[PDB]
Amino acid sequence: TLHMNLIVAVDGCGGIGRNGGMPWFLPAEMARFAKLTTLTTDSGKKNAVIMGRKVWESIPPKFRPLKSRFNVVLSKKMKEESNENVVVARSFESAVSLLQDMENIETIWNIGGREVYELGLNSPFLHQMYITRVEGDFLADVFFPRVDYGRFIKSTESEEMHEEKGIKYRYEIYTIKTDK
């Protein structure tokens, strides 16, 4: 059993990116992102993160590859990465096949790029979406894919509002109905 979960923070318009970077800076939100994508049930197993090239380029090089996770970067243009914690994959199919061959990978966390999310939303491994809903319009130029939330069951745990730097947000968790 290999789950692919999507994790994203979207604003009120569904925007995720602006000028190649994040439209906001939310340290507590990103700390939770780090915990969700890193922590495993089986110790000595690892999670993988799959991302597009522009997500990769948006991470400060001092934090690349993302620590304690196996990084897969989708790109047709990037040269191969010598670091053993990151592999450049030339297609979504080859990335997922490489990850399911690795027995020490517990969960695949799809951390986007719009096209990477879209492919995740069509993957047989699709399990959950962890969506941070940020209040307001941050004038994004890249957006989360159009998704049919009717495909999913929204979890009903209590979810409070959060605020940092005057920016408000709420967490949501969705499970594909065929799982459930």
Ligand X SMILES: NC(=O)C1=CN([C@@H]2O[C@H](COP(=O)(O)OP(=O)(O)OC[C@H]3O[C@@H](n4cnc5c(N)ncnc54)[C@H](OP(=O)(O)O)[C@@H]3O)[C@@H](O)[C@H]2O)C=CC1
Ligand Y SMILES: COc1ccc(CC(=O)O)c(NC(=O)c2ccc(Cc3c[nH]c4nc(N)[nH]c(=O)c34)cc2)c1
Where along the sequence are the contacts to ligand X (CB under 6 A)?
A: 8-9, 16-17, 20-22, 52-55, 58, 74-78, 90-92, 112-116, 119, 142
CA angle 150, 52, 59 (to 5 degrees): 115
Write the CA distances from 140 to 14, 147, 159, 175, integer angstroms: 8, 18, 25, 26
CA distance 49 to 177: 23
CB nearer to ligand X: pick between 104 and 149: 149
Is residue 53 part of an annotated ligand binding site? yes
Please give the residues from 139 up to 178 whose contact with ligand Y meets the rule CB under 6 A. Answer: none
Minimal CB distance residue for ligand X: 113
Binding of ligand Y by 132 (CB under 6 A) = yes
Q: Is residue 16 a known part of a binding site? A: yes
Taking the complex as a whole, the smallest distance from the CB of residue 175 to ligand Y amounts, in Å, to 17
Q: Does 63 bind ligand Y (CB under 6 A)?
A: yes
- Write 164-170 long-range contacts (CB < 8 A, 24+): 164/26, 164/27, 164/28, 164/29, 165/24, 165/25, 165/26, 167/24, 167/26, 167/134, 167/135, 167/136, 168/134, 168/135, 168/136, 169/9, 169/26, 169/29, 169/132, 169/133, 169/134, 169/135, 170/132, 170/133
Does 115 appear as a known binding residue?
yes
Q: Is 60 in the site for ligand Y (CB under 6 A)?
A: yes
Least distance CB 168 / ligand X (angstroms): 15
Q: Residue 48: which of ligand X, ligand Y, none does it interact with, CB under 5 to 8 A by kind?
A: none
* Minimal distance, residue 93 CB to ligand X, in Å: 8
Measured in whole angstroms, how far is the alpha carbon of residue 128 from the centre of its chain?
Answer: 11
C-beta closer to ligand X: residue 31 or 45? 31
Query: Which of 1, 2, 36, 67 shows the shortest CA–CA distance to 171?
Result: 36
Q: Which residues are documented as binding site for NADP(+)?
A: 9, 16, 21, 53-55, 75-77, 114-115
Chain contacts with ligand Y (rule: CB under 6 A): 7-9, 22, 29-30, 33-34, 59-60, 63, 66-67, 111-112, 132
